[PDB]
Design a protein around this ligand. Structure first.
Ligand code: A1A25
Ligand code: A1A25
Ligand code: ZN
Ligand code: ZN
Length: 229
């Protein structure tokens, strides 16, 4: 069920949830996938992560207009790297309210990214403070601790068995933890397990750069990360 639209792919995961996929040519790697989510909540649409670029992100909004034809209320981004935040200006151009971890907004300018308009803060138990994430509805946002990056956040969709760990979680067949340049190797394993414990009923774990996987993706990530302590 891959639906093509311009240079992006959309896959329905649940009645009100789609995966968006965009591609960037990376030296030595070919055309690399980056995934995010689109959630319909009543008369509005919510987006998790931008595409790699503004032009790709504008495509996501065009697909939404064509397939759903409801306004995009807000977008949240999972960390300050090009794959998840590279299209922030396309959301601003569209008048969409944007949210990121406060640390993601602090890091974004130096990473050559546009900061979100709103900063998220987190309770002691990792769950987003609702006063910083107003109107999020079925989007449940969780800071699991540092891993792929210090700012990485994760999201579950209430009324579904879907959770998304962004770049924190690797696929169950991965041979690498990937980008360790900005990673917290001492805390990585605990952060991966904290994500699994936050969404214990999630059976469909959306991957950052590959097709959806099982909870084995969380287990495999944490076991690889245990090796770096
Ligand atoms: C090279 N590179 C980069 O320079 C940057 C990314 C983005 P992030 O650090 O994963 O946020 C990247 C993402 C995926 C990726 N591939 C996945 C399968 C093979 C390589 C490469 C990436
Ligand atoms: C190899 N690899 C991979 O196999 C996978 C990733 C993506 P993730 O970090 O696991 O989400 C990846 C990301 C960045 C990267 N490098 C950036 C500079 C050189 C390579 C490599 C990655
Ligand atoms: Zn990243
Ligand atoms: Zn990644």
């Amino acid at each position: 069920g891959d639906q093509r639209f311009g240079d992006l792919v959309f896959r329905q995961l649940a009645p009100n949830v789609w995966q968006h996929t965009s591609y960037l040519d990376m030296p030595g790697f070919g055309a690399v996938a980056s995934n995010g989510l689109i959630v319909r909540d009543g008369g509005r649409v919510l987006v998790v992560d931008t595409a790699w670029t503004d032009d790709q992100t504008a495509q996501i909004l065009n697909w939404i207009k064509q397939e759903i034809n409801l306004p995009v209320a807000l977008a949240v981004v999972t960390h300050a790297h090009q794959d998840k935040m590279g299209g922030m200006d396309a959301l601003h151009a569209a008048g969409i309210a944007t949210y990121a971890n406060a640390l993601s907004n602090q890091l974004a300018p130096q990473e050559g990214m546009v900061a979100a308009q709103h900063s998220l803060t987190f309770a002691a138990n990792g769950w987003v403070e609702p006063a910083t994430a107003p109107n999020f509805g079925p989007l449940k946002v969780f800071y699991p601790g540092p891993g792929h990056t210090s700012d990485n956040i994760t999201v579950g969709i209430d009324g579904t068995d879907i959770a998304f760990g962004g770049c924190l979680i690797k696929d169950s067949k991965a041979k690498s933890l990937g980008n360790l340049g900005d990673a917290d190797t001492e805390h990585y394993a605990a952060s991966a397990r904290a994500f699994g414990a936050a969404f214990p009923k999630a059976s469909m774990i959306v991957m950052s750069h590959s097709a959806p996987d099982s909870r084995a993706a969380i287990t495999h990530t944490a076991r690889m990360a245990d090796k770096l302590r």
